[PDB]
From Swiss-Prot, chain A:
Keywords: Ribonucleoprotein, Ribosomal protein, RNA-binding, rRNA-binding. Part of the 50S ribosomal subunit. This is Large ribosomal subunit protein uL24. The gene is rplX. The lineage of its organism: Bacteria, Thermotogati, Deinococcota, Deinococci, Thermales. GO terms for biological process: translation. InterPro entries: KOW, Rib_uL2_dom2, Ribosomal_uL24, Ribosomal_uL24_CS, Ribosomal_uL24_KOW, Translation_prot_SH3-like_sf.
Curated annotation (Swiss-Prot), chain B:
Disulfide bonds: none annotated. The chain holds residues 3 to 50 of 60 of the full protein. GO terms for cellular component: large ribosomal subunit. Found on the solvent side of the large subunit. This is Large ribosomal subunit protein bL32. Part of the 50S ribosomal subunit. It comes from Thermus thermophilus (strain ATCC 27634 / DSM 579 / HB8). Residues 1-21 have a biased composition (Basic residues).
From Swiss-Prot, chain C:
This is Large ribosomal subunit protein bL34. GO terms for biological process: translation. One of its GO terms (molecular function) is structural constituent of ribosome. Residues 26-47 are annotated as: Disordered. The lineage of its organism: Bacteria, Thermotogati, Deinococcota, Deinococci, Thermales.
UniProtKB/Swiss-Prot annotation, chain D:
The keyword DNA damage does not apply. This is Large ribosomal subunit protein uL22. Belongs to the universal ribosomal protein uL22 family. Part of the 50S ribosomal subunit.
Amino acid sequence: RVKMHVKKGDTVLVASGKYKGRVGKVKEVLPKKYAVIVEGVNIVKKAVRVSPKYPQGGFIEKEAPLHASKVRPICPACGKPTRVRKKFLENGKKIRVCAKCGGAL
Amino acid sequence: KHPVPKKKTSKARRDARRSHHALTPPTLVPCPECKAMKPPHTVCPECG
Amino acid sequence: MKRTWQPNRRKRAKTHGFRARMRTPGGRKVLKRRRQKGRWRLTPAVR
Amino acid sequence: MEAKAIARYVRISPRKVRLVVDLIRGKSLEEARNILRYTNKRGAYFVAKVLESAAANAVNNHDMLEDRLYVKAAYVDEGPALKRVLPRARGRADIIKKRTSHITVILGEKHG
RNA sequence: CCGUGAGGGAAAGGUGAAAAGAACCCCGGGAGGGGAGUGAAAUAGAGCCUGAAACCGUGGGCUUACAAGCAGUCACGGCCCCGCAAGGGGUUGUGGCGUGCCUAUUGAAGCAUGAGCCGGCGACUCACGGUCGUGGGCGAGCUUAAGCCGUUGAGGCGGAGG
RNA sequence: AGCUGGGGCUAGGAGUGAAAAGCUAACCGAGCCCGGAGAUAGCUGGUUCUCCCCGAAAUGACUUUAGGGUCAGCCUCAGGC
RNA sequence: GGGAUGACCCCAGGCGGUAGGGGAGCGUUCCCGAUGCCGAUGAAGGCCGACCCGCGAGGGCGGCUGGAGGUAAGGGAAGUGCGAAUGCCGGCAUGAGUAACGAUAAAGAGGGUGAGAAUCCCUCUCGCCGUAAGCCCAAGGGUUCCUACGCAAUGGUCGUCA
Ligand SMILES: [Mg+2]
Ligand SMILES: [Mg+2]
Ligand SMILES: [Mg+2]
Ligand SMILES: [Mg+2]
Ligand SMILES: [Mg+2]
Ligand SMILES: [Mg+2]
Ligand SMILES: [Mg+2]
Ligand SMILES: [Mg+2]
Ligand SMILES: [Mg+2]
Ligand SMILES: [Mg+2]
Ligand SMILES: [Mg+2]
Ligand SMILES: [Mg+2]
Ligand SMILES: [Mg+2]
Ligand SMILES: [Mg+2]
Ligand SMILES: [Mg+2]
Ligand SMILES: [Mg+2]
Ligand SMILES: [Mg+2]
Ligand SMILES: [Mg+2]
Ligand SMILES: [Mg+2]
Ligand SMILES: [Mg+2]
Ligand SMILES: [Mg+2]
Ligand SMILES: [Mg+2]
Ligand SMILES: [Mg+2]
Ligand SMILES: [Mg+2]
Ligand SMILES: [Mg+2]
Ligand SMILES: [Mg+2]
Ligand SMILES: [Mg+2]
Ligand SMILES: [Mg+2]
Ligand SMILES: [Mg+2]
Ligand SMILES: [Mg+2]
Ligand SMILES: [Mg+2]
Ligand SMILES: [Mg+2]
Ligand SMILES: [Mg+2]
Ligand SMILES: [Mg+2]
Ligand SMILES: [Mg+2]
Ligand SMILES: [Mg+2]
Ligand SMILES: [Mg+2]
Ligand SMILES: [Mg+2]
Ligand SMILES: [Mg+2]
Ligand SMILES: [Mg+2]
Ligand SMILES: [Mg+2]
Ligand SMILES: [Mg+2]
Ligand SMILES: [Mg+2]
Ligand SMILES: [Mg+2]
Ligand SMILES: [Mg+2]
Ligand SMILES: [Mg+2]
Ligand SMILES: [Mg+2]
Ligand SMILES: [Mg+2]
Ligand SMILES: [Mg+2]
Ligand SMILES: [Mg+2]
Ligand SMILES: [Mg+2]
Ligand SMILES: [Mg+2]
Ligand SMILES: [Mg+2]
Ligand SMILES: [Mg+2]
Ligand SMILES: [Mg+2]
Ligand SMILES: [Mg+2]
Ligand SMILES: [Mg+2]
Ligand SMILES: [Mg+2]
Ligand SMILES: [Mg+2]
Ligand SMILES: [Mg+2]
Ligand SMILES: [Mg+2]
Ligand SMILES: [Mg+2]
Ligand SMILES: [Mg+2]
Ligand SMILES: [Mg+2]
Ligand SMILES: [Mg+2]
Ligand SMILES: [Mg+2]
Ligand SMILES: [Mg+2]
Ligand SMILES: [Mg+2]
Ligand SMILES: [Mg+2]
Ligand SMILES: [Mg+2]
Ligand SMILES: [Mg+2]
Ligand SMILES: [Mg+2]
Ligand SMILES: [Zn+2]
């Protein structure tokens, strides 16, 4: 039911935090946490036990989810926009009110 | 019947009761062959 | 010494039982109240 | 440099175990080693464990040179007490508390 | 959970922005801990925000084994501490003085009630009438009720009646 | 006029009782639960920050009144003389 | 009286106090002030202070902690101040390492297992039940049965056993 803005296809900008400034592609999107994970932005170090693979290994780097609010869709040519919705026929859209463009895939 | 204490006894008075409660360390002698320590007139844990 | 609970499974279903309660208006109202309070068990559990 | 060990939630009474802790305070690690072995108290076991871990921790972690270790300071604080019901005459039921000790041995280096 | 049953009826919320919830190594049977590592912060480590008090404990300063007491207060002195000193903080040897709090009673230190100690909960209110006082509006007058209209938490109308 | 298992019936001013006001689910001269209910209590207890001023009574009359009250007396505040 | 119509100097007096009457203030929660102001260069809360203001209730300031809130001047409204109620809920003391550890049928040794054994396993000896303390059945109980891996708790000690 939760509406988001960005989806898996998207290229987004991380607009805040340690990773502020960087653009990348949302690798996964978790509506129920209101979180997107953008590979490869937000990386962290998890320690991991010696069972098979990481059978020797003690440390993994993984990319942490981000509050879906922290990121913005890039809009080809810019780094703004928000949302707009064009209808035409029969239905559907995303446009940049920045303006006016894709997503799409 | 059924005697009871009349006053909670003070932190001062219970601690002073305990002035004798302190332990004294075990009585120990060096062992005839091995390096180790033993209570006197006993059979040494090492090299009896 | 002989005490007050001498469990017998027939006596229990015959006395506090569900069909018991339902036979008498006194007892339908027992069930009504228990149901309204939202009791999990409306009536004693005998095996 | 100085090194410690803390045994936590040891099921034994602070009053009881404090007594043996007093036996080995300011002792060279070697006399402390001998005192607890021949002490007869359930708490000589538990202290000896904490003694060692601190001795281990000293050489093995903080690079302390074992032969000069003494017991700088040490003590048992009182952990959270588990309560149980002790049924009694005429229906009565007191509660007795099985208690808890936090044992702490703190080691430092002799100056010789 | 208690009760045969009708029925009674609790406690118990909070790591971090994010699990990044501590791989590995050391003592250990384990629990627990010490290094490592994460983290802005780990006495935020999961018995996890803040973390009071009673209560227990370790270290330090002053002190006490020929004094006797509601435990304090006045004074001088010794020791320790902060400093610019004539200064101030701590402690307390000797000397003066000194019958706990509350309640209830003509009278309580009272050998009369209540209280082990700490934290939190805990008792003169509201409505409509009445009566005085007071701050204002209008004054031979003053004043609307139900309701009607309107309203970003906008007010006005309404004179039955009193 | 025996003891006993199992199955039944009788109950709250009611039952039952070789009779003690015994027993009726560990307190029966009238069971327990929930409710009228925050019954009533002329009685006992308790009543929570600070400073300033003033400052009583424990008597009289009536009282199914006597450790409760109503009026008077004595306190206090405002205005007046 | 000072004539400043005063917030103020001078002079003169009064100021023990329970039931009570009266008056001025402090503080707590909340609202208007507020689309503001304080705040991560650190809010509320906490811990200290020998410092400053107030007669006092209180208010400041400073340091430490804490880490996301607070809320002036002026005014408004209350679930507004606790030491006592054999009060209520919780927490922690004292008695105290004290009484007990629940049938006086009774134990000893060797060996095994295990980090750890008076308490588990085996052997041997000893003791106690035997119209029972043995064995069957009915209630009632409800997986307690069997076996493997366990010992935080439960077991009035211990436990490797249950
Ligand atoms: Mg019989
Ligand atoms: Mg019972
Ligand atoms: Mg049957
Ligand atoms: Mg259900
Ligand atoms: Mg007993
Ligand atoms: Mg019993
Ligand atoms: Mg107790
Ligand atoms: Mg039941
Ligand atoms: Mg959080
Ligand atoms: Mg740590
Ligand atoms: Mg802290
Ligand atoms: Mg913290
Ligand atoms: Mg805690
Ligand atoms: Mg927080
Ligand atoms: Mg904490
Ligand atoms: Mg000390
Ligand atoms: Mg003499
Ligand atoms: Mg002397
Ligand atoms: Mg004196
Ligand atoms: Mg009292
Ligand atoms: Mg009295
Ligand atoms: Mg009297
Ligand atoms: Mg009298
Ligand atoms: Mg007395
Ligand atoms: Mg008396
Ligand atoms: Mg008294
Ligand atoms: Mg209190
Ligand atoms: Mg009124
Ligand atoms: Mg009025
Ligand atoms: Mg008027
Ligand atoms: Mg309308
Ligand atoms: Mg029969
Ligand atoms: Mg029957
Ligand atoms: Mg029968
Ligand atoms: Mg019947
Ligand atoms: Mg009758
Ligand atoms: Mg008979
Ligand atoms: Mg009953
Ligand atoms: Mg009876
Ligand atoms: Mg009756
Ligand atoms: Mg009656
Ligand atoms: Mg009524
Ligand atoms: Mg009442
Ligand atoms: Mg009556
Ligand atoms: Mg009453
Ligand atoms: Mg009359
Ligand atoms: Mg009376
Ligand atoms: Mg009168
Ligand atoms: Mg004067
Ligand atoms: Mg006065
Ligand atoms: Mg006077
Ligand atoms: Mg910061
Ligand atoms: Mg607040
Ligand atoms: Mg602060
Ligand atoms: Mg405010
Ligand atoms: Mg105000
Ligand atoms: Mg209140
Ligand atoms: Mg009081
Ligand atoms: Mg004694
Ligand atoms: Mg004795
Ligand atoms: Mg004994
Ligand atoms: Mg015995
Ligand atoms: Mg072996
Ligand atoms: Mg072995
Ligand atoms: Mg025989
Ligand atoms: Mg069966
Ligand atoms: Mg059972
Ligand atoms: Mg089971
Ligand atoms: Mg079995
Ligand atoms: Mg087994
Ligand atoms: Mg166990
Ligand atoms: Mg045990
Ligand atoms: Zn554009």
